[PDB]
Amino acid sequence: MYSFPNSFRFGWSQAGFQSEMGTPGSEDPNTDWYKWVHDPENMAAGLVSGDLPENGPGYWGNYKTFHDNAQKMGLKIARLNSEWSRQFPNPLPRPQNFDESKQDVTEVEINENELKRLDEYANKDALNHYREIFKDLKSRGLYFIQNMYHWPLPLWLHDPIRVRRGDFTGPSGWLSTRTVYEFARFSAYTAWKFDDLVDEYSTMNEPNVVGGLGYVGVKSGFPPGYLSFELSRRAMYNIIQAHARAYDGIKSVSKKPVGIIYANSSFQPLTDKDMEAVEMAENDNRWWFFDAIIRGEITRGNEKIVRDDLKGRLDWIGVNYYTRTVVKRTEKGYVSLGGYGHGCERNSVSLAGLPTSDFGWEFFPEGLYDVLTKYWNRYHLYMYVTENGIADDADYQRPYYLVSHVYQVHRAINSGADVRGYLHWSLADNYEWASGFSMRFGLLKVDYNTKRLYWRPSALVYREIATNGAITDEIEHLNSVPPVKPLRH
Amino acid sequence: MYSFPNSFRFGWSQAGFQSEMGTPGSEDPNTDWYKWVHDPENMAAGLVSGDLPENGPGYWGNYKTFHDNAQKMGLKIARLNSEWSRQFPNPLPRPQNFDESKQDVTEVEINENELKRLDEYANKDALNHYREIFKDLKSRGLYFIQNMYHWPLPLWLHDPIRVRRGDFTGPSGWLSTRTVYEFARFSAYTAWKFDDLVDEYSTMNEPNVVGGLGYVGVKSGFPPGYLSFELSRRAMYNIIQAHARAYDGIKSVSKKPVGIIYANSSFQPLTDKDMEAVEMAENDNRWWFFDAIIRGEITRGNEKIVRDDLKGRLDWIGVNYYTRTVVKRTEKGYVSLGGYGHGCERNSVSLAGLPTSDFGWEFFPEGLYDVLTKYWNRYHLYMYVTENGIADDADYQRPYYLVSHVYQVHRAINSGADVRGYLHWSLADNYEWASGFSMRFGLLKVDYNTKRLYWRPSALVYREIATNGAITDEIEHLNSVPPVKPLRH
Amino acid sequence: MYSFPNSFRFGWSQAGFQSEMGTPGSEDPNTDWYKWVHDPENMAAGLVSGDLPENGPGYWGNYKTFHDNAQKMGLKIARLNSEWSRQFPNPLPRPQNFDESKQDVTEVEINENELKRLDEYANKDALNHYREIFKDLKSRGLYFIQNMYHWPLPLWLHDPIRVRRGDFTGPSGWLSTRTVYEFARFSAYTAWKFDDLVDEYSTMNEPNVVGGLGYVGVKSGFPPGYLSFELSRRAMYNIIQAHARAYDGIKSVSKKPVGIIYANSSFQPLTDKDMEAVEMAENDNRWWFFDAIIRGEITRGNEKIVRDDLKGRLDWIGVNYYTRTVVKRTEKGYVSLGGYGHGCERNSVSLAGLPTSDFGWEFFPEGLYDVLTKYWNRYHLYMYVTENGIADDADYQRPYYLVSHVYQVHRAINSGADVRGYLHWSLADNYEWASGFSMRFGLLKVDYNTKRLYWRPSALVYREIATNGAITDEIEHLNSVPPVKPLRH
Amino acid sequence: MYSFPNSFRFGWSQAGFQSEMGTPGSEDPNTDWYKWVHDPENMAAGLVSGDLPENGPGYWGNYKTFHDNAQKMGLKIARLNSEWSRQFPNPLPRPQNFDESKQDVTEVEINENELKRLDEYANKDALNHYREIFKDLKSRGLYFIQNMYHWPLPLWLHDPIRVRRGDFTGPSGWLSTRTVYEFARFSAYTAWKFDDLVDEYSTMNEPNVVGGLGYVGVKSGFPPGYLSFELSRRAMYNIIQAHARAYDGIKSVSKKPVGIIYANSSFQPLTDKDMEAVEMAENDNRWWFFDAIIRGEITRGNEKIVRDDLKGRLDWIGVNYYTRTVVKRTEKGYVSLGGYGHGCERNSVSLAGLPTSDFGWEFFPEGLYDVLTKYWNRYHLYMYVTENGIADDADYQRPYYLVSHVYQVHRAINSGADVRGYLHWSLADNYEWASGFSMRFGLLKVDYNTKRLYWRPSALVYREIATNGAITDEIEHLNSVPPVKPLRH
């Protein structure tokens, strides 16, 4: 039996674009993503699945049912996000005393007049519907973490198609400092209007995936899909700043804690002779972002600076984890090997014989322990495992995946890491971005035809860990690798 | 949601040889089976796995734990059997007024003196330990069906090795009418001593597998493994008679109902042009046995008789079901096709694309409905589904197998069949005869090393059906074929 | 035994970019492709394998060996192409009396002065080395078809990176009419200098793949990778014209026949209710291009015209064939289903149970017969099966693939189609564009490390068909589907 | 390129029961095997496939065709056997001066009168037909090894059914010394009548499989299928003696060499800590038989004797090899692991990742080198690799299997072993005993429906090695493990 502190909470994570739409009159066509996925050229090139969000789970209308099932499993923490385009679907007045040609955004003026002025533009319905939803959530008794940004930018801030075509004379999302300015004002307004329901705050969700897949990994089908290393750094630089600003904006209206949710991977060395490759990958992929928003360390050009306007802008770290990444040195370089981690064949086995999910990701619970202890030992900020799950509609690997990973959180905790919760990537099946509805990550299966939810056996396993605050003795065998034998290779 | 009558009960089945041994001092080396499996020649020929029962689950010593877990799932019916060799491990006095050379056993004298005399020979410990066990079971609140015979005969009644070598001058199990005589006396004695704990009675378990695999299907590794069509009929004839006699013996001491548990398969025609092949297979394999012990119809030679000493000797029918059998006509014949039913490759897919278990049996829930309605419409005796399960250690197919089959019982019931219970083949993993411990059929996994039990996710699914007396709405999707895609082919 | 006419010839096809480089001093860095594949951004996005052509087979230096092995198999026809960038690696003088802003290119002036002037710019070495190569080929006794264009454009005519970034102020390949003008002059110059060695002429290789994958199917990794339906039509329009012009240019200097090599697929209807979908797909994908360069029919805007400068510009049709495409209607639309044809999982089985190659293409010999008879019945131009093969390094499916397809050519011939040769896609392993060296299509395996060639068993099977001018009786069983059973699913 | 001596010959092996029948009027129902396989009980128990030899290849009538195809591949050695039951289908007069109760057969009187007397009983037709066949073979120019015994005993010497039932009062094959006596007389008669056509002599084929599978490994379905360790030793003892006697009988009439063909396996240790297990397995399985017929060493009881009537009765050793056997120590014991060697799953992969054939045997060329060098270093008798092949109808693994094994012969030769030929197990598909026609081991595929032969690509590979006396450079890559990737697991 593996016990967790009385204060450790078990729950789920969810996003607006992925789960909200589905119920009639729940559509939101005002985001760069809704557009990106309906684009005829994007569909013909096969960049997007062809699946439309409009036919999702239905969390905008069926949220009671979602929370009912969440209560039954005995979950005590939820992390949702507000959709920016629902509040402000129309352009806001250009914010005076703001020079777009200014590279840095060392500050933003947020005061009650400002908020009061933003209220004139905000969409009262969207605002009221959300309040109802977070209200219902709070009544059930769940701790609530609120995420400000989970990918989609409103169209007036980013037309993904124009940028894809190479046209930079339009709303260009994270490439423009305008977006940075408005994000900070948005953060504060929302904090300002929901602080009575929120418990902890998250500025954005996996900012690194937005900058990375949108401008470098163009085959993933993420917007704007314009390949450029340079522009990728521009967006990342703007994202870091948009965080510091949002952090300060929320503080201006609240004392609640504020952190960020980041996409992680455990970098494992292909050979003992690959230790340095690991260190280099973690820098390039993890440390540079957090040293920026924590130690305030960053570098324009190659000029390592230290902007005190960035220094100390994080309260907690959200840890997202799915699988590992195997790297190998290259004189000075390092590389990411295929046949391991995220680059595996679907429903088969990795080059190491570990099974792989419906998305082609390799089973590797051990990597969570590595990620949690590295963050803990380097920054000592408490953390939540804000995402962890597996695409597996049949539910063959999920029971083992769930118990094995919850086991590693427990293991990190005993090594001294302050981890306060485990939030499974998803309660129910949702829309997987470029992949569509085909990748099912939920503890509950969704009949997209009737919007009805079903309990997959692993939901009943989760109810035992949650309802017990521990990996009980009777399910302790699931803390193992799913038998590859009966599964495909 | 599929509801079952308030009186329908959910539980499990188990056998003595398969689950009892394991706890120190629980050994029983006095059966033809314990011997058959320790034989050096049998092991070298690969007829038996090499796995020894002595290292089983431990139900002789850990039965409280088994019943505890059984209570937690909300099971309300159990069907165990007493081991003949535990009561009478030593020979009994030849029963006077009994001519071995007599083909038929139209009767056996059982009266209180007789029983009282048998008590002089019975093993008081074995007798007391069993009483304790069935007591503990009964306290928990479970209905109890008791099976008199579940394969092993005591050595003094059958030396399997001598017969395997072709030596018929020794104790020869079902080939000798002596065995028939003693079985009837054994039945009555046990009924006589346990009638206060028993609820319903079963004479024997799958008598057809004993006669069939022991003398025709010699590759299965069942004793005595002497190939002969003729001797196979001799044993079957003696088994039918041993039932009628046991039935009468139990009646002599009790009013409780008495039925038999039989191994079934749903005979499906390979082509529409194969209907007659099905009818012929059901006769040859099902109807001839039950017409015998019910309508009293049988045939010595080819001489269709009607022994009133057999007529009407059944109260209820136990239905065991695992998979199907595909047959095809042959001018006058019919055949059993491979690549379907029981003759499939392990963890692969049948010739029809249906997944197969760790034993190579094909998924076919529909066959249960066929078996239940055919028995019901032909004999109208109420029934229990006394066995149904799947060898599946990983637990990939079990959730679907369980819910899909329970669904067909519900379906048979609504067609008018009086079915009063569903007993899953096994609570925990046990010893699978010639196959050893390798074929895991339990809702609970057993660490044979520590005798510790674990809940497989399907146990938690069963607890929902049992605890609810219905296939609740949230698990109603399991009533489907496991996705073959992620599984091996 | 299946016999072919005495005049039917058996051989192979090969391309310059794919097979030439490999031998020291054989590099050609002056093409849009050599650049596209060395681009650091393209590699990081995973658009190109990371494999470089510089390390190919070595046909520039080891061509004797290639022809030796070709003789041994008894092949009598070869179809190679000249690399444009090898002749004219430097820009040519803008051709006066030519207005780039002119949409149509109804003509090009080619006369002996012109040719004589081009000779001043041509790379004498490249020119001499090629002559040596085609000489050696011709001595062995092989009929020689010569292809003018097999994808790469010289850098001075197309910078793929600039266009990928959305910059259209540079050399833009098929988007500029300049390219059309120069292609026609190039065709004539080459015809003019090699007509003594050539037997038949081909203007370009699969023009439809260039226009299609380069501007619509952007995930394939073909240059320039700029997604635009409109630009795709522009390039296709320019390609059709560049053909007519090249056709006329070659005629100006030679009487030899001139055709085009096109990429094909057999459109099969998913259901009987899908016949119209097939017809629509063949139009959209086959007929519109050939009606253009044959009946002279085309349409600017939606304005169906008939440019007599295009009318009748084809002598023969090269048929390339690999697999099928399954389509399904959509009210007015039609769609391409995945799990069939080219969109199958690698080394597995299609949705129809047909095996798939190392590239994920489905086995479907029957489609060749369909393609050959449809072209024959619609245009009655004789044809060659200029490409047909399979990525299969192990050589498991090749023997069956080869014999089954050669069998369908024979079948088309007997239905009355004038087909004069079968050219297997490749003698040896070569560079598969965006896929790298990993997709091995050769009858001969190449150790890229030593440039050494090896005979795969299917080479010895081909030597029997070629050396015999027929599918001999002893290998006639290969005319079947490879057994899926032993292969992966 | 791997060259073989000019005197090394390449050919095939074949057996009478397996290949002869098929052509009308070629039936031979007078063997224990023909009976064993038609037995209704044996078929119902699934001990025999249900496939009947009567429908085999047809080598009794189509032998010209077989030799034609054999010539074309350039084979120069053949090893066939005469069917005992064809010569003497009726009982011979009990041979006077012969006491059945005599354990040892230290001698047999063979002289010209005897032979002349046997000629009175011999079947002239069978005798003439064989002569024609070996004549035709010899004309083509092939060296001919002749095997006296390749399993079937005539019915008058063995009724397998009676023994299976445990009845030892009848003709009991190798259990009776009568069989030993008659075998020696049979050997001499045949040598006496064919010595003009024969080149070298073999007494029997894999005697160890007859004794082993017939009396211990009873699941294989070999006659008589009576499980007994003791009787297994009796038959082995009688087989050794029947060899010495046959050896002497042949010498009495010929100077040609005489050896024996034995079934081999390379014993590999599971762990370095398993060396002794290997040594023990080779003794138990290889050395005890050859020390007997060579050093004359044997042991009745446990009494190690040295019968000079056995001493030195071997001229050459026939080496049969298919796969390996992995063993592991057991205090004093050793064991044969499953998932390796012969005990692997069909068309899958062994526990070591090596592919497996249609029979479930693991790819392990290296074992041939081990077997050849161990025999050479211990007895220094020259040898032939009389059998080596793979069940593989599709022909996926055969090309690699063939070249890899021929490569190891070459390797043994260079280590100093006198190996004079490689005879592939089979030219064409034949009847695989208990397995039926389903296991196809031929270089040529047989359409059992028309008796027509087809060349599998590996036949064309063999023609290159044979026709060249070497592994030419162009096919030298086949000396590797078939790629498991595209194959099933």
mmCIF file of N, CA and C in Angstrom, chain C residues 1 72 347 358 393-397 399-400 445 452-457 460-461 463-464 473-478 482-489, chain D residues 1 72 347 358 393-397 399-400 445 452-458 460-461 463-464 473-478 482-489:
data_model
loop_
_atom_site.group_PDB
_atom_site.id
_atom_site.type_symbol
_atom_site.label_atom_id
_atom_site.label_comp_id
_atom_site.label_asym_id
_atom_site.label_seq_id
_atom_site.Cartn_x
_atom_site.Cartn_y
_atom_site.Cartn_z
ATOM 1 N N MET C 1 2.370 -20.926 -68.754
ATOM 2 C CA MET C 1 3.440 -20.062 -69.341
ATOM 3 C C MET C 1 2.725 -18.918 -70.010
ATOM 4 N N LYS C 72 23.431 -9.359 -67.572
ATOM 5 C CA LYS C 72 23.264 -10.678 -66.996
ATOM 6 C C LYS C 72 21.808 -11.059 -66.795
ATOM 7 N N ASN C 347 4.356 -2.510 -43.563
ATOM 8 C CA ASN C 347 4.550 -3.916 -43.247
ATOM 9 C C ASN C 347 3.429 -4.416 -42.378
ATOM 10 N N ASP C 358 7.189 -1.978 -47.435
ATOM 11 C CA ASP C 358 7.916 -1.206 -46.452
ATOM 12 C C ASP C 358 7.540 0.256 -46.478
ATOM 13 N N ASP C 393 13.189 -4.330 -48.770
ATOM 14 C CA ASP C 393 14.566 -4.698 -48.593
ATOM 15 C C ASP C 393 14.797 -6.187 -48.361
ATOM 16 N N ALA C 394 13.889 -6.853 -47.659
ATOM 17 C CA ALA C 394 14.078 -8.261 -47.323
ATOM 18 C C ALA C 394 13.849 -9.142 -48.510
ATOM 19 N N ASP C 395 13.023 -8.652 -49.424
ATOM 20 C CA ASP C 395 12.669 -9.353 -50.639
ATOM 21 C C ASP C 395 11.555 -10.394 -50.441
ATOM 22 N N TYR C 396 10.759 -10.244 -49.375
ATOM 23 C CA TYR C 396 9.648 -11.148 -49.096
ATOM 24 C C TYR C 396 8.518 -11.060 -50.109
ATOM 25 N N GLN C 397 8.068 -9.858 -50.420
ATOM 26 C CA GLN C 397 6.975 -9.693 -51.358
ATOM 27 C C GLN C 397 7.344 -9.499 -52.791
ATOM 28 N N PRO C 399 9.107 -11.121 -55.215
ATOM 29 C CA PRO C 399 8.903 -12.164 -56.219
ATOM 30 C C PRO C 399 7.455 -12.249 -56.675
ATOM 31 N N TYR C 400 6.510 -12.175 -55.744
ATOM 32 C CA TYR C 400 5.091 -12.235 -56.091
ATOM 33 C C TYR C 400 4.620 -10.966 -56.788
ATOM 34 N N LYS C 445 20.413 -5.257 -54.196
ATOM 35 C CA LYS C 445 20.613 -4.570 -52.940
ATOM 36 C C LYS C 445 21.945 -3.874 -53.018
ATOM 37 N N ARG C 452 28.831 -1.655 -53.359
ATOM 38 C CA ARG C 452 28.737 -2.998 -53.915
ATOM 39 C C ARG C 452 27.293 -3.411 -54.134
ATOM 40 N N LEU C 453 27.006 -4.131 -55.218
ATOM 41 C CA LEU C 453 25.638 -4.586 -55.514
ATOM 42 C C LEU C 453 25.468 -6.100 -55.226
ATOM 43 N N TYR C 454 24.257 -6.510 -54.840
ATOM 44 C CA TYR C 454 23.941 -7.908 -54.526
ATOM 45 C C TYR C 454 22.649 -8.254 -55.202
ATOM 46 N N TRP C 455 22.515 -9.511 -55.620
ATOM 47 C CA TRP C 455 21.307 -9.993 -56.285
ATOM 48 C C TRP C 455 20.293 -10.478 -55.247
ATOM 49 N N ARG C 456 19.106 -9.903 -55.249
ATOM 50 C CA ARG C 456 18.090 -10.354 -54.324
ATOM 51 C C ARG C 456 17.433 -11.483 -55.126
ATOM 52 N N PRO C 457 16.912 -12.527 -54.462
ATOM 53 C CA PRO C 457 16.285 -13.613 -55.204
ATOM 54 C C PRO C 457 15.353 -13.168 -56.299
ATOM 55 N N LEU C 460 16.956 -12.952 -59.776
ATOM 56 C CA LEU C 460 17.057 -14.229 -60.455
ATOM 57 C C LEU C 460 15.689 -14.619 -61.030
ATOM 58 N N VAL C 461 14.595 -14.149 -60.450
ATOM 59 C CA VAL C 461 13.283 -14.481 -61.017
ATOM 60 C C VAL C 461 13.096 -13.630 -62.266
ATOM 61 N N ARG C 463 15.438 -12.395 -64.205
ATOM 62 C CA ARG C 463 16.289 -12.920 -65.247
ATOM 63 C C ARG C 463 15.603 -14.048 -66.024
ATOM 64 N N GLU C 464 14.692 -14.797 -65.396
ATOM 65 C CA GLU C 464 13.957 -15.888 -66.053
ATOM 66 C C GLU C 464 12.871 -15.386 -66.995
ATOM 67 N N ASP C 473 6.654 -21.674 -66.923
ATOM 68 C CA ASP C 473 5.753 -22.498 -66.114
ATOM 69 C C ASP C 473 6.275 -22.724 -64.702
ATOM 70 N N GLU C 474 7.574 -22.887 -64.546
ATOM 71 C CA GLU C 474 8.050 -23.141 -63.220
ATOM 72 C C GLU C 474 7.954 -22.043 -62.190
ATOM 73 N N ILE C 475 7.703 -20.799 -62.602
ATOM 74 C CA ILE C 475 7.591 -19.690 -61.647
ATOM 75 C C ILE C 475 6.201 -19.076 -61.681
ATOM 76 N N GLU C 476 5.280 -19.735 -62.364
ATOM 77 C CA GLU C 476 3.905 -19.270 -62.519
ATOM 78 C C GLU C 476 3.054 -19.226 -61.250
ATOM 79 N N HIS C 477 3.573 -19.743 -60.153
ATOM 80 C CA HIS C 477 2.816 -19.717 -58.912
ATOM 81 C C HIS C 477 2.987 -18.359 -58.205
ATOM 82 N N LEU C 478 4.047 -17.632 -58.567
ATOM 83 C CA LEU C 478 4.344 -16.339 -57.982
ATOM 84 C C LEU C 478 3.296 -15.349 -58.414
ATOM 85 N N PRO C 482 1.261 -12.386 -51.757
ATOM 86 C CA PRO C 482 2.156 -13.005 -50.796
ATOM 87 C C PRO C 482 1.337 -13.476 -49.583
ATOM 88 N N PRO C 483 1.659 -14.651 -49.025
ATOM 89 C CA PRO C 483 0.945 -15.179 -47.860
ATOM 90 C C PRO C 483 1.044 -14.200 -46.716
ATOM 91 N N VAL C 484 -0.087 -13.657 -46.302
ATOM 92 C CA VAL C 484 -0.092 -12.696 -45.212
ATOM 93 C C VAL C 484 0.204 -13.351 -43.889
ATOM 94 N N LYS C 485 -0.184 -14.609 -43.756
ATOM 95 C CA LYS C 485 0.034 -15.339 -42.525
ATOM 96 C C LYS C 485 1.390 -15.186 -41.870
ATOM 97 N N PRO C 486 2.495 -15.511 -42.573
ATOM 98 C CA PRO C 486 3.807 -15.368 -41.913
ATOM 99 C C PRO C 486 4.282 -13.936 -41.701
ATOM 100 N N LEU C 487 3.639 -13.011 -42.399
ATOM 101 C CA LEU C 487 3.993 -11.608 -42.334
ATOM 102 C C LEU C 487 3.288 -10.855 -41.217
ATOM 103 N N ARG C 488 3.860 -9.728 -40.834
ATOM 104 C CA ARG C 488 3.279 -8.876 -39.800
ATOM 105 C C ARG C 488 1.911 -8.304 -40.208
ATOM 106 N N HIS C 489 1.100 -7.990 -39.191
ATOM 107 C CA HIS C 489 -0.225 -7.349 -39.327
ATOM 108 C C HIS C 489 -0.171 -6.242 -38.233
ATOM 109 N N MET D 1 32.925 -14.305 -51.837
ATOM 110 C CA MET D 1 32.661 -15.600 -52.536
ATOM 111 C C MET D 1 33.241 -16.673 -51.652
ATOM 112 N N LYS D 72 18.638 -29.493 -63.835
ATOM 113 C CA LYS D 72 18.606 -28.068 -64.093
ATOM 114 C C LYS D 72 19.242 -27.248 -62.985
ATOM 115 N N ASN D 347 5.867 -19.320 -36.992
ATOM 116 C CA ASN D 347 5.903 -18.037 -37.675
ATOM 117 C C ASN D 347 5.855 -16.911 -36.678
ATOM 118 N N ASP D 358 7.587 -22.285 -40.391
ATOM 119 C CA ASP D 358 6.206 -22.707 -40.328
ATOM 120 C C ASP D 358 5.999 -23.859 -39.373
ATOM 121 N N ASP D 393 6.483 -22.550 -46.873
ATOM 122 C CA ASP D 393 5.779 -22.542 -48.124
ATOM 123 C C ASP D 393 5.890 -21.236 -48.903
ATOM 124 N N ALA D 394 5.926 -20.104 -48.212
ATOM 125 C CA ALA D 394 5.948 -18.809 -48.886
ATOM 126 C C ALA D 394 7.292 -18.523 -49.478
ATOM 127 N N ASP D 395 8.311 -19.117 -48.874
ATOM 128 C CA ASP D 395 9.687 -18.962 -49.291
ATOM 129 C C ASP D 395 10.346 -17.678 -48.762
ATOM 130 N N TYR D 396 9.798 -17.110 -47.681
ATOM 131 C CA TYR D 396 10.349 -15.906 -47.066
ATOM 132 C C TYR D 396 11.709 -16.117 -46.420
ATOM 133 N N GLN D 397 11.848 -17.153 -45.613
ATOM 134 C CA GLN D 397 13.105 -17.406 -44.939
ATOM 135 C C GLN D 397 14.068 -18.312 -45.632
ATOM 136 N N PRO D 399 15.695 -18.502 -48.621
ATOM 137 C CA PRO D 399 16.919 -18.004 -49.246
ATOM 138 C C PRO D 399 18.015 -17.731 -48.228
ATOM 139 N N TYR D 400 17.673 -17.117 -47.102
ATOM 140 C CA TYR D 400 18.657 -16.825 -46.061
ATOM 141 C C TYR D 400 19.109 -18.083 -45.334
ATOM 142 N N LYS D 445 7.801 -26.189 -55.088
ATOM 143 C CA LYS D 445 6.469 -26.271 -54.535
ATOM 144 C C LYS D 445 5.702 -27.269 -55.361
ATOM 145 N N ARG D 452 2.073 -31.229 -60.219
ATOM 146 C CA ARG D 452 2.954 -30.307 -60.922
ATOM 147 C C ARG D 452 3.943 -29.651 -59.975
ATOM 148 N N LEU D 453 5.184 -29.440 -60.414
ATOM 149 C CA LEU D 453 6.211 -28.804 -59.575
ATOM 150 C C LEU D 453 6.475 -27.340 -60.013
ATOM 151 N N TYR D 454 6.847 -26.482 -59.059
ATOM 152 C CA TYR D 454 7.127 -25.064 -59.315
ATOM 153 C C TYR D 454 8.404 -24.710 -58.616
ATOM 154 N N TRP D 455 9.167 -23.789 -59.201
ATOM 155 C CA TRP D 455 10.433 -23.338 -58.629
ATOM 156 C C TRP D 455 10.189 -22.181 -57.659
ATOM 157 N N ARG D 456 10.599 -22.340 -56.415
ATOM 158 C CA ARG D 456 10.440 -21.261 -55.465
ATOM 159 C C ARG D 456 11.738 -20.474 -55.685
ATOM 160 N N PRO D 457 11.724 -19.146 -55.497
ATOM 161 C CA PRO D 457 12.945 -18.377 -55.702
ATOM 162 C C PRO D 457 14.179 -18.983 -55.090
ATOM 163 N N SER D 458 14.072 -19.674 -53.972
ATOM 164 C CA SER D 458 15.274 -20.244 -53.389
ATOM 165 C C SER D 458 15.871 -21.372 -54.202
ATOM 166 N N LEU D 460 16.247 -21.162 -57.474
ATOM 167 C CA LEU D 460 17.119 -20.404 -58.350
ATOM 168 C C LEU D 460 18.362 -19.947 -57.574
ATOM 169 N N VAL D 461 18.271 -19.784 -56.263
ATOM 170 C CA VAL D 461 19.464 -19.388 -55.505
ATOM 171 C C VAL D 461 20.356 -20.617 -55.382
ATOM 172 N N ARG D 463 20.506 -23.183 -57.422
ATOM 173 C CA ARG D 463 21.113 -23.437 -58.708
ATOM 174 C C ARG D 463 22.402 -22.632 -58.894
ATOM 175 N N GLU D 464 22.524 -21.461 -58.262
ATOM 176 C CA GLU D 464 23.727 -20.621 -58.352
ATOM 177 C C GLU D 464 24.891 -21.164 -57.535
ATOM 178 N N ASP D 473 29.559 -14.048 -55.134
ATOM 179 C CA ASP D 473 29.546 -12.736 -54.483
ATOM 180 C C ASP D 473 28.184 -12.060 -54.554
ATOM 181 N N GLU D 474 27.477 -12.214 -55.656
ATOM 182 C CA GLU D 474 26.216 -11.540 -55.728
ATOM 183 C C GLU D 474 25.099 -11.990 -54.820
ATOM 184 N N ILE D 475 25.215 -13.162 -54.193
ATOM 185 C CA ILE D 475 24.165 -13.650 -53.292
ATOM 186 C C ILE D 475 24.687 -13.800 -51.872
ATOM 187 N N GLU D 476 25.880 -13.286 -51.623
ATOM 188 C CA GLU D 476 26.538 -13.368 -50.323
ATOM 189 C C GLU D 476 25.875 -12.604 -49.177
ATOM 190 N N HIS D 477 24.858 -11.819 -49.478
ATOM 191 C CA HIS D 477 24.180 -11.078 -48.427
ATOM 192 C C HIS D 477 23.131 -11.967 -47.731
ATOM 193 N N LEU D 478 22.722 -13.042 -48.410
ATOM 194 C CA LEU D 478 21.733 -13.965 -47.889
ATOM 195 C C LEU D 478 22.318 -14.708 -46.717
ATOM 196 N N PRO D 482 16.923 -13.699 -41.511
ATOM 197 C CA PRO D 482 15.867 -12.995 -42.215
ATOM 198 C C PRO D 482 15.380 -11.825 -41.342
ATOM 199 N N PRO D 483 15.089 -10.667 -41.950
ATOM 200 C CA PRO D 483 14.608 -9.500 -41.207
ATOM 201 C C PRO D 483 13.336 -9.851 -40.476
ATOM 202 N N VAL D 484 13.381 -9.815 -39.157
ATOM 203 C CA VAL D 484 12.208 -10.145 -38.366
ATOM 204 C C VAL D 484 11.147 -9.082 -38.468
ATOM 205 N N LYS D 485 11.572 -7.844 -38.661
ATOM 206 C CA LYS D 485 10.646 -6.736 -38.761
ATOM 207 C C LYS D 485 9.410 -6.953 -39.606
ATOM 208 N N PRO D 486 9.557 -7.296 -40.902
ATOM 209 C CA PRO D 486 8.340 -7.490 -41.714
ATOM 210 C C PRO D 486 7.536 -8.747 -41.402
ATOM 211 N N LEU D 487 8.168 -9.666 -40.685
ATOM 212 C CA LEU D 487 7.553 -10.929 -40.334
ATOM 213 C C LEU D 487 6.750 -10.877 -39.044
ATOM 214 N N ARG D 488 5.843 -11.825 -38.892
ATOM 215 C CA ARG D 488 5.024 -11.927 -37.688
ATOM 216 C C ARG D 488 5.858 -12.214 -36.430
ATOM 217 N N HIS D 489 5.312 -11.803 -35.280
ATOM 218 C CA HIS D 489 5.880 -12.040 -33.936
ATOM 219 C C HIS D 489 4.636 -12.510 -33.127
#
